[PDB]
A paper describes a structure:
Imidazoleglycerol-Phosphate Dehydratase (IGPD, EC 4.2.1.19) is inhibited by 3-amino-1,2,4-triazole (3AT), as well as the experimental herbicide, (R)-2-hydroxy-3-(1,2,4-triazol-1-yl) propylphosphonate, (R)-C348 and other compounds including β-Carboxamido phosphates and Pyrrole aldehydes. The conservation of the oligomeric state is critical for positioning the two imperfectly repeated metal binding motifs (D/NXHHXXE) from each subunit on the molecular two-fold axes of the particle, generating the 24 active sites that each contain two octahedrally coordinated manganese (II) ions. The monomer also shares the typical IGPD duplicated fold, with a bundle of 4 α-helices sandwiched between two anti-parallel β-sheets.
We further demonstrate that known inhibitors of IGPD, 3AT and (R)-C348, act to restrict the growth and development of Acanthamoeba and we determine the structure of the complex between Acanthamoeba IGPD and the most potent inhibitor, (R)-C348, to analyse the molecular basis of its potency. Within the active site the inhibitor binds with its N-linked 1,2,4-triazole ring positioned between the two manganese ions, with the N2 and N4 nitrogen atoms residing within the coordination sphere of Mn1 and Mn2, respectively. The C3-OH substituent group of the inhibitor acts as a second non-protein ligand to Mn1, with the sixth ligand position around Mn2 being occupied by a water molecule (HOH1) that has been proposed to have a key role in accepting a proton from the substrate’s imidazole ring during the initial stages of the reaction catalysed by IGPD. The phosphonate group of the inhibitor sits within a predominantly positively charged pocket surrounded by residues from subunits A and C, which include K170A, R92C and R114C, and a water-mediated interaction (HOH5) with H48A. The extensive network of hydrogen bonds surrounding the phosphonate binding site is completed by S191C and K193C from the C-terminal loop of the protein, which occupies a position that essentially shields the active site from the external solvent. In the Ac_IGPD/(R)-C348 complex the conformation of the C-terminal loop and the interactions it makes with the phosphonate group of the inhibitor match those observed in previously determined complexes of Arabidopsis thaliana_IGPD in complex with the substrate IGP, whose mode of binding resembles that of the imidazolate reaction intermediate.
Numbering used by the authors:
A (entry chain F), C (entry chain H), D (entry chain G), F (entry chain L): 3 to 197
B (entry chain J), E (entry chain I): 4 to 197
């Protein structure tokens, strides 16, 4: 019932996403970048979202337009799947480790696009995904989802652990934030409106 | 789980009605608009129902009003919980507002204590002095007879910092007073929460 | 009910534990060290675990082999009680204070033994339990339980408050992580296996 | 005969290892990552182990799951091959240089999984093996082998020399630790048990 | 290669029997359990057989007991070696215990000397004062008439540090006293090891 | 028998060396510099080498050409005495103290000439051997022996003790490295060649 399909095409990328918020965690993601597929796969699995994604992008240039545009379209789908912002918890937070790494994510379904991202990534790339694109993906996702997202890797020593723990924490926090809670028609805001 | 408290001194005359198992509605008139907004947010995100009126000595400053509102609110919270059994006891939450992020942690401990760190930079937000904001939280915690930790981890806008703090506090309080497990269990290894 | 009984003996210690994860918080714990007893009693109480433990140890040497071996056996019991790692939340986190002290624990039922522990204890002992054994207990528990455990005392000033807040937080995080959630046969991992 | 065959399958990797502790140094290792194959070949050669390894892994993501899971299975095979922990030296240590680099490894067949690893690598990758995975390999090996491993690169200027000197030292130290020494049934522990 | 030594003062009364070519068995009763554990580890990992009893002045503190036990143990070790010929002379080893790592280096030199650095942080381990731990190793080396270097390179648990140090010492002593090469050869360019 | 003789003459020095690797520690060394004789005598004794050496050198200039050329000739002799690099341990390491001084030596019979030497000598001369010539002797030995040598004085306070502990440690490491071990035809390298 809470789902969305979004298609988007530019000169750089051509993307389709299908998203169900009330899923079982199944993913079929092919961005053209394996490590990004793994991160979005983790996001779906731990968020209990169902996610289908295809991207034909300009990887001959670099991984940037693909990664950013996948995040944009994912964010748009999440926004649409949420629907009217009523009857939900609105706020979610979670910690997820991976071995020595620990990450925290905090989500506010605010209708104010904003993100604060600090992943402490040390390397240049994880597989074929540039580390600089990893915060960019979370920022672009948050702004297109029209929500407020804070993600911090508190510490760690392995960048795959850092990134993955961040996606896992993000997934758990998003899941909590969009959970139905209390009266179905209550807007969870003192101003009575979440656009 | 509702309580009504009335309290009058030479500085302030206050009435509060608080229900723990509400829908978030509030009617809060402290005399200070920003404080009203903070307690409205507390009620909204705690799913508490809160009525509050204060006739206070604002011609002096905002201090006695804000503190006493916190004192009476805390007394009402303590009373509304009633016997400290069958509840989660511990709650914690994060709430942002844009660039600011706050955490609140609550222990329904019967030991009044607060650790508050809001990183507010300004002198006032509207007519509420920034120094009164941690004082409100501390006074609330002590009169509620509980342990409260509130940290603004970072931010750049004092309205965002303060409001994120009240939202996080609301969420943690809601969790801590949630009924969970056997109704008669005291959630303490010492068997007593006074 | 998810329960386990474990008996272990070496030349240093002879220990028996019985643990139920789906308990009411009852404990009957006698390790030979009162403060360790109190910490394990707080663990069971706030975890809603039921815990029986006896240790006949070598306290004439010091508190080390007793404390460590109690953690090993408790960890083994926890691992065995969880049984097949399916149908559970897998991730838990919690904060617990005690007056001026605040602790955070994060749990990942990962089948990867790992612990990151930072308790900020200033004393040599609390009662008859050496402070250096308190992180060792958490690390040994985590590794024998085959899970990932992160425990941090953020701040405080009383070592009994710090240690107890740590065990309380740990309890609450373990309780969340082992809570049944979603389809009973789902393995909460993108790799489909948690051994 | 001190030998083992171990197989392991997840959604990320499918691996088989065959190992003899009392070998001549022969290796047939194909992880999918040439530099890792070279390190493991070195380990077998200088440890006088015989090692066969095959991994079908998710290298399209990155080198992490392959490398980690190869180390996990290798460690498990080591644990099994040692068998009952009696009649062996238990402790091993060795230094190995490669030109300007010098490494030390220390092994304790302890039945307590722990590793302390400090390789001082400066690069992002050596061949297709990410440098961050090299400590992760040694740590995962040690924990799966249920032993205590300390490896330090003391100094050096070339990461291939640093990593290779570390595997060489590890090989020599492991060879020493599992060498039969003294009465066949003596347990090398004051507590009389090494599980 | 066995020796028996008995020593009595107004502080302590000690008997030791030590065999170098043992299986690692021990019966050590110093009156201090953690010291017993360390000397048991020493015997076990050195493949020495060690008997020790001490009736000491533990009402004062652990010092005279611990020191005199090390003194007598060292004297026994010196005597058990006998004429310093046909041995390796030099020994070294590392031993960890979990996060801690120690190194010991032995030279059967007939020059009493020790360099000890265990990085212990606590005041006591059980009833053995941490400051007595290096003193034990030093007093052992001087009475054994040898050169001993023991370093805890790093660690975080003092029982692990001390225990790793005794294990490494044991392994190094075992190597140093191992028979190797012609039985009459003195392992010194000066042709004498007194 | 693993023995060699080398005779070498330049306008600066005239040297004859005879070396046996499988000796009893006997030496007869006359370099012209007593302290250097004492160091090479210690090396022979603790390596269980037999060594004869005579140098007629330009001591009226300084100790340099003598000390370096003795090291060169000795290294050449060591290389010839080893012969085919097969059937040996290849790697050796050792610590030797002398009173307050402690030194570590590590040897790799690598066929790659390289030395890393750090003796921490404070004086100008020990007897008639200039302190700067002591690391020069070790480096020139290693490079002429065609092997990798690392020697460190970890600490100390007496330069005779530091130097002598260094030569003792070197001797012990060299003895271990050239010890016969395993099949006599095996080449102890993954590349199958030690030239
Ligand atoms: O978070 P909201 O939109 O529910 C209500 C806030 O009062 C709005 N706000 C935005 N900046 C400061 N306050
Ligand atoms: O948190 P409680 O009151 O349930 C039990 C604690 O053991 C009491 N305590 C308070 N300071 C130290 N311990
Ligand atoms: O957390 P898991 O085992 O469910 C899946 C991870 O992808 C495995 N992993 C372990 N290190 C890096 N990734
Ligand atoms: O190393 P072991 O297990 O042979 C004997 C040790 O006494 C056990 N131990 C583990 N931590 C402190 N001691
Ligand atoms: O180690 P030794 O006694 O075999 C021979 C040394 O040369 C003696 N010495 C002691 N200080 C300096 N040299
Ligand atoms: O140490 P070797 O020559 O047995 C084999 C090495 O792989 C060769 N090498 C030299 N530099 C890097 N590797
Ligand atoms: Mg010749
Ligand atoms: Mn961009
Ligand atoms: Mn992964
Ligand atoms: Mn006041
Ligand atoms: Mn506002
Ligand atoms: Mn221990
Ligand atoms: Mn307590
Ligand atoms: Mn990993
Ligand atoms: Mn190489
Ligand atoms: Mn003394
Ligand atoms: Mn011990
Ligand atoms: Mn020169
Ligand atoms: Mn000398």
């Amino acid at each position: 019932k809470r789902e969305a399909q979004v298609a988007r095409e530019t000169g750089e990328t051509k993307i389709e996403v299908r998203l169900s918020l009330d899923g079982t965690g199944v993913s079929d993601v092919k961005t053209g970048i394996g490590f990004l597929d793994h991160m979005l796969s983790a996001l779906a699995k731990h968020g209990r979202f169902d996610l289908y994604l295809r991207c034909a992008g300009d990887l001959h240039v670099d991984d940037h337009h693909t990664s950013e545009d996948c995040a944009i379209v994912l964010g748009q789908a999440f926004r649409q799947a949420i629907g009217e912002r009523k009857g939900i918890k609105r706020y979610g937070s979670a910690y997820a480790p991976l071995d020595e790494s620990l990450a925290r994510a905090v989500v506010d379904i605010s209708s104010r696009p904003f993100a604060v991202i600090d992943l402490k990534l040390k390397r240049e790339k994880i597989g074929e995904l540039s580390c600089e694109m990893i915060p960019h993906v979370l920022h672009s996702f948050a702004t297109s989802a029209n929500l407020t997202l804070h993600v911090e890797v508190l510490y760690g020593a392995n960048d795959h652990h850092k990134a993955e723990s961040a996606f896992k924490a993000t997934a758990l926090a998003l899941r909590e934030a969009v959970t139905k809670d209390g009266p179905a028609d209550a807007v969870p805001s003192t101003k009575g409106v979440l656009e």
